Amino acid sequence: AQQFQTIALIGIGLIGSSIARDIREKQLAGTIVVTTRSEATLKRAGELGLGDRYTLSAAEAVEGADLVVVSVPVGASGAVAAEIAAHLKPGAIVTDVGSTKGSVIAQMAPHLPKDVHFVPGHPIAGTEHSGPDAGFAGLFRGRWCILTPPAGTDEEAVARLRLFWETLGSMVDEMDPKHHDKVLAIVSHLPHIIAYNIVGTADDLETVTESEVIKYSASGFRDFTRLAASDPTMWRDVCLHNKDAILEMLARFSEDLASLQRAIRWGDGDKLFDLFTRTRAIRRSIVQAGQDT
């Protein structure tokens, strides 16, 4: 079943460890090499049996690796690329899984040598949990993964990465990085930002107690709390590195909310009914597509 003789995983949290478990289950690698920055996380990965070889040095980890998967918060991407650059073998494929792509490409590509193939990726799959114990086999089954190869990228390298993600159970699409960043700003980043904002709002109230919010959360609030429990480093970094697309979507959202607020202020039941009717269609399409939870 092997697709790569050696796969090096740099970062071994939710995504990296889920990839590790799938590689083991599908026998996709001759050798899995695991690296992460801390001794504590590396030890956990060892106790979990996520790799065959382990190291604290990303430079050492990539020596002789055919595929290098970088699964770290996006603001760390450049530092990883700088540390591994000199140690990559000719023809290595370097990929990532970052939630932003334009930034990652800009941060990493200046460090990477001409003889390696850089094929950025993004699996459209996750949970609110983090670290190696949070990962599991099958996270990517029936999900989409987006690749964003720069112009002139080796087409065989792209095909091998497409096959890899398909083997993990994903459907694969390719797009330009700027388009990726616009699409993800609305389908992912804005939803998280808005969830953080509403949970912060509720926390700040004096008249309604924390106990009340918790007790009665099954009337809608709980759904937003799940997203707002995600890792703060990950989401800090997305906001810092997809700024322009996020700000565009926030401005659209806030224009629309002013109009909805005015319909509520003026008791415009017909406008409210029309908005609430229009939104149902999207859910029905998601359900028919099998993308619902």
Ligand X SMILES: NC(=O)c1ccc[n+]([C@@H]2O[C@H](COP(=O)([O-])OP(=O)(O)OC[C@H]3O[C@@H](n4cnc5c(N)ncnc54)[C@H](OP(=O)(O)O)[C@@H]3O)[C@@H](O)[C@H]2O)c1
Ligand Y SMILES: N[C@@H](Cc1ccc(O)cc1)C(=O)O
Query: Taking CB under 8 A as the rule, does residue 63 contact a copy of itself?
Result: no
Enter the tokens of residue 248: 């565009």
Enumerate the β-bridge partners of residue 95: 69
What part of residues 59-88 is at the interface with ligand X (CB under 6 A)?
71-74, 76, 79
Smaller CB distance to a copy of itself: residue 110 or 216? 216
∠ CA 140-30-138, nearest 5°, is 15
| Alpha-carbon gap, residue 67 to 56, rounded angstroms | 18
26: amino acid identity, one letter: K
What part of residues 22-81 is at the interface with Cl ion (CB under 5 A)?
66
Question: Is the Cβ–Cβ distance between 82 and 70 less than 8 Å?
Answer: no
Enter the tokens of residue 72: 């770290």
> x/- string (CB under 6 A) for ligand X, residues 35-64?
-xxx--x-----------------------
36 belongs to an annotated ligand binding site:
yes
Query: Taking CB under 6 A as the rule, does residue 169 contact ligand X?
Result: no
**Distances in whole angstroms, Cα of residue 163 to Cα of each of 13, 92, 166, 173, 225:** 23, 16, 5, 12, 36
Find which of ligand Y, ligand X, a copy of itself, none residue 169 binds, CB within 5 to 8 Å per kind: none
> x/- string (CB under 8 A) for a copy of itself, residues 149-188?
------------------------x-----x--xxx-xxx
| Alpha-carbon gap, residue 287 to 91, rounded angstroms | 42
What part of residues 95-134 is at the interface with Mg ion (CB under 5 A)?
113
User: Residues interacting with Cl ion, by CB under 5 A?
Assistant: 4-5, 66
User: Residues interacting with ligand Y, by CB under 6 A?
Assistant: 99, 124-128, 188, 219-220, 230
